[PDB]
PDB file of C-alpha atoms in Angstrom:
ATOM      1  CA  UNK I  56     -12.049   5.927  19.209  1.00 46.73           C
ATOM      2  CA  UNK I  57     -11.695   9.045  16.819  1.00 43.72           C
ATOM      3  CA  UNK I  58     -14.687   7.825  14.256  1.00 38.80           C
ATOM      4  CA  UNK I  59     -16.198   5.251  12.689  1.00 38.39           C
ATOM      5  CA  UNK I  60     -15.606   4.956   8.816  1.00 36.91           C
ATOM      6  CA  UNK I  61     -16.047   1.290   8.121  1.00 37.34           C
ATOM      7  CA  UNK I  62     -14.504  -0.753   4.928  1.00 35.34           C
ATOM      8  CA  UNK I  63     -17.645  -0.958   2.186  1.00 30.95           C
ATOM      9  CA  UNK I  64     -19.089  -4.280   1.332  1.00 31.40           C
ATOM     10  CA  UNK I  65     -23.289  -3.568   0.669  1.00 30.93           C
ATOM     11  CA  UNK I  66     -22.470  -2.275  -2.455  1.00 30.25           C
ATOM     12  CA  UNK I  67     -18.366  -3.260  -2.669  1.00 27.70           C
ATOM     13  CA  UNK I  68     -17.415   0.407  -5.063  1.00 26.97           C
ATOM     14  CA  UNK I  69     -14.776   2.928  -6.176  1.00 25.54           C
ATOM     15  CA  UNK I  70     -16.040   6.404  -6.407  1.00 28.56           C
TER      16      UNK I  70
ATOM     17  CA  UNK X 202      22.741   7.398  -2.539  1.00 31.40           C
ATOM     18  CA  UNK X 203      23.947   3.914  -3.795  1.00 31.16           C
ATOM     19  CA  UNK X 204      22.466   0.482  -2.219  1.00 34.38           C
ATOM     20  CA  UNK X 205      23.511  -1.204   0.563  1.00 33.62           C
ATOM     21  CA  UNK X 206      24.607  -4.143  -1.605  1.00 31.29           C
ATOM     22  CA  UNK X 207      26.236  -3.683  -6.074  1.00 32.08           C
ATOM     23  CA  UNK X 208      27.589  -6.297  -8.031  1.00 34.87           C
ATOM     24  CA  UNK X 209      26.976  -3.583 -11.391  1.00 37.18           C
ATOM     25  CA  UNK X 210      23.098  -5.061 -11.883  1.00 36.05           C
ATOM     26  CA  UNK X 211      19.685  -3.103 -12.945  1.00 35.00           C
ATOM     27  CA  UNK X 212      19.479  -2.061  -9.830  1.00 37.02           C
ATOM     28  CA  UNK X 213      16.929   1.020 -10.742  1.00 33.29           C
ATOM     29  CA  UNK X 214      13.280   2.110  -9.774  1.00 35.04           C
ATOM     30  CA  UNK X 215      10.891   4.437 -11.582  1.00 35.43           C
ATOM     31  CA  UNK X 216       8.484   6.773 -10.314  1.00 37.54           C
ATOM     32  CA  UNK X 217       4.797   6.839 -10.730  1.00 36.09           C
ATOM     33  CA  UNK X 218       2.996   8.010  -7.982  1.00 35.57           C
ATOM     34  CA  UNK X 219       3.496  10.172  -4.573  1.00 32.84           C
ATOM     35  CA  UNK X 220       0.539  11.623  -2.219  1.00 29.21           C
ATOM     36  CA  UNK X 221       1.056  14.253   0.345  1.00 27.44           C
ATOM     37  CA  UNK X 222      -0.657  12.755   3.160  1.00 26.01           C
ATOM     38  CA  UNK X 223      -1.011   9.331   4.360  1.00 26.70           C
ATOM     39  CA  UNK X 224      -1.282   6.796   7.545  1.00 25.83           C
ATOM     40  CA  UNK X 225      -0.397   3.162   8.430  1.00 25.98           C
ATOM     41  CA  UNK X 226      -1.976   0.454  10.722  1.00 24.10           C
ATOM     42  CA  UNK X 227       0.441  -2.349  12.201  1.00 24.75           C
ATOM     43  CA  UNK X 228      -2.439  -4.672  12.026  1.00 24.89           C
ATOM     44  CA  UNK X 229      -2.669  -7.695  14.077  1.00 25.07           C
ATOM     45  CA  UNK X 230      -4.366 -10.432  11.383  1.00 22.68           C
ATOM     46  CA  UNK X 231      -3.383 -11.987   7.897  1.00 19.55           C
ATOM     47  CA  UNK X 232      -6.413 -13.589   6.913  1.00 15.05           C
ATOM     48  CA  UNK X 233      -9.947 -14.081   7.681  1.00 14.94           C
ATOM     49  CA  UNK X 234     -12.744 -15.334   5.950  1.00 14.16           C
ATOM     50  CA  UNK X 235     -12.940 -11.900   3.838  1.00 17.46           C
ATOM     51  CA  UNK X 236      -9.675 -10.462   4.010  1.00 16.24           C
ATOM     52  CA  UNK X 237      -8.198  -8.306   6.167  1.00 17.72           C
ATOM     53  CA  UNK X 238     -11.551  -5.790   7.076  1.00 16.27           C
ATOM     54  CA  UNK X 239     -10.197  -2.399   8.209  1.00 14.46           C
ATOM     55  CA  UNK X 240     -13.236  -2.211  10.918  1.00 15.98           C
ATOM     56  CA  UNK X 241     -11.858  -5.187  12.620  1.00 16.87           C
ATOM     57  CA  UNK X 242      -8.664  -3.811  13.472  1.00 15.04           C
ATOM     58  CA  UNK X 243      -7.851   0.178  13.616  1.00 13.73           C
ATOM     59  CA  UNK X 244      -9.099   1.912  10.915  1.00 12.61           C
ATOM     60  CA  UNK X 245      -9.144   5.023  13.332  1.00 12.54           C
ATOM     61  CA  UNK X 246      -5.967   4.294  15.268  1.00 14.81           C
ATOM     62  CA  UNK X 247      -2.858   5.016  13.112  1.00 14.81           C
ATOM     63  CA  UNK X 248       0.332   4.273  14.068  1.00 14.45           C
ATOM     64  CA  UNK X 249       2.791   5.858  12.118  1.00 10.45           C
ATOM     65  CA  UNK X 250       1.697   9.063   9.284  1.00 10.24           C
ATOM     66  CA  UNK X 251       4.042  10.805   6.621  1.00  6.97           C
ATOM     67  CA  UNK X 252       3.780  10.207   2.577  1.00  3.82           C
ATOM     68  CA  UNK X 253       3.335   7.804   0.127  1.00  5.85           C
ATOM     69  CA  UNK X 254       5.947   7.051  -3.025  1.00  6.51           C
ATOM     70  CA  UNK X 255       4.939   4.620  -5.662  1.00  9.59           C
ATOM     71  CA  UNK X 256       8.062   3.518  -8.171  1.00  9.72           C
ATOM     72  CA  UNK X 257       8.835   0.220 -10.169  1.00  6.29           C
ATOM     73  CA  UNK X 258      11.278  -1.721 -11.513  1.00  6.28           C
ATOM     74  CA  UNK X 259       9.844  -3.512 -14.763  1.00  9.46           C
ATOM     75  CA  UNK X 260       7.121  -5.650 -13.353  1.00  6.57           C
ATOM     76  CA  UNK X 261       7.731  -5.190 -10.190  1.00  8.30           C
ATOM     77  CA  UNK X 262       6.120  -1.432  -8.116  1.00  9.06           C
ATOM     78  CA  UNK X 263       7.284  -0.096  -4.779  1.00  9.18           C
ATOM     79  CA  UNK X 264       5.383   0.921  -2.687  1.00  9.67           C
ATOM     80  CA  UNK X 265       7.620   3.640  -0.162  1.00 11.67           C
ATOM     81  CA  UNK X 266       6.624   5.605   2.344  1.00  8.84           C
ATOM     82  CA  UNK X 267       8.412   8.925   3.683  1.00  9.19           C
ATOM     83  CA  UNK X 268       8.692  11.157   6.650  1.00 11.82           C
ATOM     84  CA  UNK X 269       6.299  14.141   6.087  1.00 13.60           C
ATOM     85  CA  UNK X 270       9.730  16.588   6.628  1.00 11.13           C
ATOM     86  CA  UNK X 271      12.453  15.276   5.147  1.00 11.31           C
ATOM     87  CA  UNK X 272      11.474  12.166   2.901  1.00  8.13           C
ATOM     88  CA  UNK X 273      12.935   9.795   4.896  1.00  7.57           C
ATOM     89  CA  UNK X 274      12.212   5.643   4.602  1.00 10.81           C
ATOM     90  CA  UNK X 275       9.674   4.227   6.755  1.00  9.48           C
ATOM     91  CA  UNK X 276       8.779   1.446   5.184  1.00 11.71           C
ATOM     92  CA  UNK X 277       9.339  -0.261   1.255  1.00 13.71           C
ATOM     93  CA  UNK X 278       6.462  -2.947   0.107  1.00 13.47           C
ATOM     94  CA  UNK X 279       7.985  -5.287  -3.291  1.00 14.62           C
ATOM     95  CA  UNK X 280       4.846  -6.123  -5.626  1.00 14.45           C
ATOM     96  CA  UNK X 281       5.208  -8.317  -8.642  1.00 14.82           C
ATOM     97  CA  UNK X 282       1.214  -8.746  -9.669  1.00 16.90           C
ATOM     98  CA  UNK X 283      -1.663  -7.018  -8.202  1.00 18.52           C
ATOM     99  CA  UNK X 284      -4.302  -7.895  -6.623  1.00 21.51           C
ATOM    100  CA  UNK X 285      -1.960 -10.172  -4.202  1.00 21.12           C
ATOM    101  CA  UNK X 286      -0.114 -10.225  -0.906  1.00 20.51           C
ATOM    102  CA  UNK X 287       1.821  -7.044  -1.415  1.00 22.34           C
ATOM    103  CA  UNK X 288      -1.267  -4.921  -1.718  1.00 24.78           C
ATOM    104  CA  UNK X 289      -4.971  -5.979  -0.846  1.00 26.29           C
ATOM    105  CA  UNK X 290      -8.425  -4.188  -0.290  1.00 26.53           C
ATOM    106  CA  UNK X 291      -8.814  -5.097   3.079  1.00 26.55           C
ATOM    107  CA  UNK X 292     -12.698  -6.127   2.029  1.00 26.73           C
ATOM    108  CA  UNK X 293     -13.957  -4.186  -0.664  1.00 22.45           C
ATOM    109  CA  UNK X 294     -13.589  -0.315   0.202  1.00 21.75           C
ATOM    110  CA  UNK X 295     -10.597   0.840  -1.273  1.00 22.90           C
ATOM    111  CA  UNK X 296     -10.282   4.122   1.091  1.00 24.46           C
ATOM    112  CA  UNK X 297      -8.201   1.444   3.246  1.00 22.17           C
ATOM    113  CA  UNK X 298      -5.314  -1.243   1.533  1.00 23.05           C
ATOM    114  CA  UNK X 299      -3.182  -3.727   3.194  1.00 22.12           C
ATOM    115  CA  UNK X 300       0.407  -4.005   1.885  1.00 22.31           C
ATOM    116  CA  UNK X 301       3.529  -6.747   2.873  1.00 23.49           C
ATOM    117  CA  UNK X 302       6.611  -4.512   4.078  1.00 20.76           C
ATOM    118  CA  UNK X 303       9.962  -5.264   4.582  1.00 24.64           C
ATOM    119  CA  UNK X 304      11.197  -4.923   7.625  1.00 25.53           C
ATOM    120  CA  UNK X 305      14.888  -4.071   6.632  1.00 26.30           C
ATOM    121  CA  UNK X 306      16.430  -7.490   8.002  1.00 30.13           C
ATOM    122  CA  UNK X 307      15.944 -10.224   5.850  1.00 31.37           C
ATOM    123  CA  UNK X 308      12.028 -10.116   7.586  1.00 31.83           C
ATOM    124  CA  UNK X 309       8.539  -8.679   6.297  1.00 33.18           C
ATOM    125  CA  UNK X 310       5.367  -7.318   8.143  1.00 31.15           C
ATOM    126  CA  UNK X 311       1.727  -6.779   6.619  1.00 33.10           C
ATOM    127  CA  UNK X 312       0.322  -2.952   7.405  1.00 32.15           C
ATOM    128  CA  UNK X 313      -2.992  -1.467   6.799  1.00 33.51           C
ATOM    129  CA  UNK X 314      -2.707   1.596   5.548  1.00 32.46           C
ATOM    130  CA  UNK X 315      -5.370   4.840   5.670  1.00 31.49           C
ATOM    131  CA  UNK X 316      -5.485   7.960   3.433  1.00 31.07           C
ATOM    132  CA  UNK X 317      -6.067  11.562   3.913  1.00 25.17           C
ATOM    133  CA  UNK X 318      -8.931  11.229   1.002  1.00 27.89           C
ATOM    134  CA  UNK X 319     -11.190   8.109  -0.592  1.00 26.17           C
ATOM    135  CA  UNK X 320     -10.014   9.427  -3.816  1.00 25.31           C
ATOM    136  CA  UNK X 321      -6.144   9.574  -2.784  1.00 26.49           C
ATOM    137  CA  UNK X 322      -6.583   5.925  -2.297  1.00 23.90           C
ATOM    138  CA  UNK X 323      -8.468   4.838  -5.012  1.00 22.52           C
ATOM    139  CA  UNK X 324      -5.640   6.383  -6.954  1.00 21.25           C
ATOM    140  CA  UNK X 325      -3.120   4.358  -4.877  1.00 20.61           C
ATOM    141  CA  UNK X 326      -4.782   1.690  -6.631  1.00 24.00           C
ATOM    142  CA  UNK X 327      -5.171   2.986 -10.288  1.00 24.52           C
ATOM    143  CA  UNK X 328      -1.247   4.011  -9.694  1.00 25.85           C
ATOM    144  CA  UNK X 329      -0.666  -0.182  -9.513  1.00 22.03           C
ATOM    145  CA  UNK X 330      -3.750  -1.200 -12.008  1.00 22.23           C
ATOM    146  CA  UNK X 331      -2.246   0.881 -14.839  1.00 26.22           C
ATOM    147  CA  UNK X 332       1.399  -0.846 -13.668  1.00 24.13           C
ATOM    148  CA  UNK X 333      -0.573  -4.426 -14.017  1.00 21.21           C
ATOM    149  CA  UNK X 334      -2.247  -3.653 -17.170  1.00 19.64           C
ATOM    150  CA  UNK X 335       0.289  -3.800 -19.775  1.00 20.56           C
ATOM    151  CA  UNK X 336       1.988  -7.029 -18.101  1.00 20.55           C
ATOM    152  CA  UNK X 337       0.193 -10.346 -16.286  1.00 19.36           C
ATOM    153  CA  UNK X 338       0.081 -11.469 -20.047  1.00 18.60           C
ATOM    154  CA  UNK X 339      -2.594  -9.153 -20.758  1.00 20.51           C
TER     155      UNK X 339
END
């Protein structure tokens, strides 16, 4: 709706 | 202010973390096949915003959230071991969690929750991973 910021998986990190 | 219900126990809570800024997500799954995933559900689309509190009780953290203007409770999430129900990373990016709230009535709910930065959240988790580190018979 707003944006699109999907949850990380490809490379699953922190910083 | 006192607690709802005394009998003269260690009823207490300690501090360790507040952020300025966050969101919540009254998320319609508990589990699929990788967790929770923040793109399945509304990771756009809050439904409530204020600010996050983090405080603990031995091994057990808090996680509170306030109103944005006068502190006020939302919500309170009990954790006693982390990773687990009471806070998750809804697959693997931890700009997003999932924590188990009480609803105030003997009842709980699971929210997603969204933060104002990536690095405001990953510190939502190091503010419970430093609180698991020196228990879990470690």
């Amino acid at each position: 709706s707003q944006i699109t910021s999907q949850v990380t998986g490809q490379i699953g990190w922190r910083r | 202010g006192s607690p709802n219900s005394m009998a003269t126990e260690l009823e207490y809570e300690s501090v360790l973390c507040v952020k300025p800024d966050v969101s919540v997500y009254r998320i319609p799954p508990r589990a699929s096949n990788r967790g929770y995933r923040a793109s399945d559900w509304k990771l756009d689309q809050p439904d409530w915003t204020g600010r996050l509190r983090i405080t603990s009780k031995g091994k057990t953290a808090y996680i509170k959230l306030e109103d944005k203007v006068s502190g006020e409770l939302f919500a309170q999430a009990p954790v006693e071991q982390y990773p687990g129900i009471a806070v998750e990373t809804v697959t693997d990016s931890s700009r997003y969690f999932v924590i188990r709230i009480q609803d105030g009535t003997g009842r709980s709910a699971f929210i997603g929750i969204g933060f104002t930065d990536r690095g405001d959240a990953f510190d939502f988790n190091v503010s419970l991973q430093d609180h698991f580190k020196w228990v879990k018979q470690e």
